[PDB]
Every structure is written in C-alpha cells, then in structure tokens.
C-alpha cells in the first residue's frame with residue numbers, strides 16, 4: 081500500500097496551491113492537508129505513512145489550546161512554506177524539502193501564549209535553561225523529544241550524515257522564528273542582495289534565506305484575505321492582552337500592544353508592524369525568490385485595509 085495518494089475535494093485541491101489559502105475550521109482535515117502537502121512537495125516516498133501520521137498526531141497533542149499559538153497556526157505556517165517550495169521547485173535540496181515542512185509544523189510546539197520577555201520577567205525555569213530565543217530552543221527540544229518516541233522516527237531511513245543535516249536545518253529554521261533575530265538577518269540579506277554577494281552555494285547564505293522564509297511563513301496571517309487577516313488579529317491580541325494582564329500582576333505596566341485598556345490603538349499598532357516588519361520581510365523575500373511576490377502583494381493589500389480602518393471607512 082504505497083499507491084495511497086491523499087486527495088482533497090476540488091476547491092481545496094486548487095486553492096491549496098495559492099499563498100492565501102485558509103486551511104478552514106475542520107480540525108480533523110488538517111492532518112490530511114499536511115500529508116497532502118508533504119507528498120506533493122517531497123514525495124510519497126519521503127516518509128513512512130504510519131510513522132508520519134503517528135508523528136503528526138503527537139505534534140498535535142503537544143500544542144496547547146491557546147487563542148493563537150496553536151495547532152492551526154502550526155499547519156497554517158507549514159502551508160505557507162509548501163506554497164513557497166512549490167513556487168521555487170528547483171532551488172531546494174531533497175533534505176531541505178523534508179526538513180522545512182516538519183520544522184514549520186513543529187516551530188511553536190508547547191507554546192503557552194507568552195513571549196520570551198514574559199518568561200524572563202516571570203523568572204520561568206525555561207529562561208534559566210535558555211538565555212536567548214527561550215521558547216524557540218524549547219520548541220526544537222520538544223521536536224527532538226517527539227522524533228525519539230517509539231515508531232515516531234520519520235527520518236529513520238536517512239544516513240547518520242543526512243539525519244544530522246536535516247536536524248540542523250530544523251534547528252536553525254526554528255531558532256529563526258524568534259522575531260528578535262529577524263531584523264539583523266534581513267538587513268544582512270538586503271545588503272548581500274544589493275552588493276551582489278548573495279550566493280545560494282554558500283551554506284551560511286542558504287541558512288539566512290531559510291530564516292527569512294521562516295519569518296515569512298510565521299507572519300503569513302498578514303498575507304491572507306482581509307476577513308481572515310482581521311479575525312486572526314483578534315486571536316493574536318487575545319494572547320497579547322492576557323500577557324499584559326500577567327505583566328500587571330507582576331507589578332509591570334506592559335507595552336501598549338499588550339494593554340487591553342488601549343484597544344483603540346490596535347489599528348495604528350498594525351500599521352507600525354506592517355511598515356517595520358511584514359512589508360520589509362516580504363520585500364526582501366521577493367528580491368531573493370521572485371515567485372513569492374503574491375505574499376508581498378497580499379500584505380500590501382492588508383496594510384491598506386488597516387489604513388481604511390483608521391480613516392473610519394471600516
């Protein structure tokens with residue numbers, strides 16, 4: 081039984097190829113959507129179906145019921161990566177194709193809905209184990225834990241060598257989702273691209289480009305149709321405000337972004353974020369990988385919808 085091609089209904093079969101695809105509210109379809117993407121992106125031969133299924137279900141089990149950093153976010157970020165891989169077929173190694181979809185599914189494993197900042201101020205044990213990229217080193221750790229469960233080793237056929245390469249791709253990919261690291265990473269990529277020194281044969285260059293891809297997938301809620309973007313924003317701020325509440329409980333005025341008393345300032349907050357983070361991210365990404373331009377175009381569409389919100393045209 082290896083003639084077992086997963087297939088989706090027609091509207092999903094078609095719209096899954098597009099950057100702006102929303103995976104829907106039917107939680108029980110998300111595993112199938114992921115397997116579909118791995119099979120098309122990687123091959124039906126990349127992974128042992130029974131092992132992959134058991135891995136996916138343990139990954140699912142280890143996401144929490146938080147408003148935003150949940151299992152739906154995991155599968156959403158994996159679909160953005162699938163769209164990028166599918167639009168840039170010949171640029172990526174076999175090991176990269178395998179590693180990056182798994183990295184994406186695992187990148188926020190066991191997230192509690194709190195920032196690295198909050199962990200450090202609370203004095204969480206994870207803050208003493210991991211001084212920087214606190215939640216991200218934890219996510220990678222939880223990824224290795226699950227790969228080491230009996231019957232969960234989806235990489236079992238790789239050589240000793242290929243196995244260490246793939247786990248090194250996953251680790252770098254996951255650390256890159258720490259937005260604090262994004263700014264420097266993109267500045268370097270921008271300067272490399274413009275002085276023409278960017279070289280996809282330099283592993284250290286590839287590493288930077290995969291990190292940017294990871295930021296791009298991770299922020300991909302800004303690249304959706306406006307109603308998806310707007311409703312996802314509600315989940316994002318549900319977390320931010322809970323953390324604000326927890327800051328207040330520690331005796332700390334949170335930043336306004338996290339203060340639920342300053343709801344009125346959200347639209348302006350989203351402008352800043354689109355201008356300082358999202359637009360620059362998708363701009364540099366489009367410079368390096370031209371077929372990713374639809375993510376930049378959709379982001380720009382959403383910036384303009386937030387400007388309309390401010391001007392009371394909605």
Ligand SMILES: Cc1nn(-c2ccc(Cl)cc2)c2sc(C(=O)N3CCCCC3)cc12
Nearest residue numbers: 259260298299300301302316337349350353
């Ligand atoms: C405002 C705001 N909205 N979002 C947001 C919106 C959409 C998606 Cl799809 C995801 C996030 C975020 S994430 C973030 C942040 O952590 N920093 C810390 C590091 C430097 C930049 C600011 C700030 C904001």
Ligand SMILES: [Mg+2]
Nearest residue numbers: 187188215257
């Ligand atoms: Mg994260």
Ligand SMILES: [Zn+2]
Nearest residue numbers: 153187188298
């Ligand atoms: Zn994430």
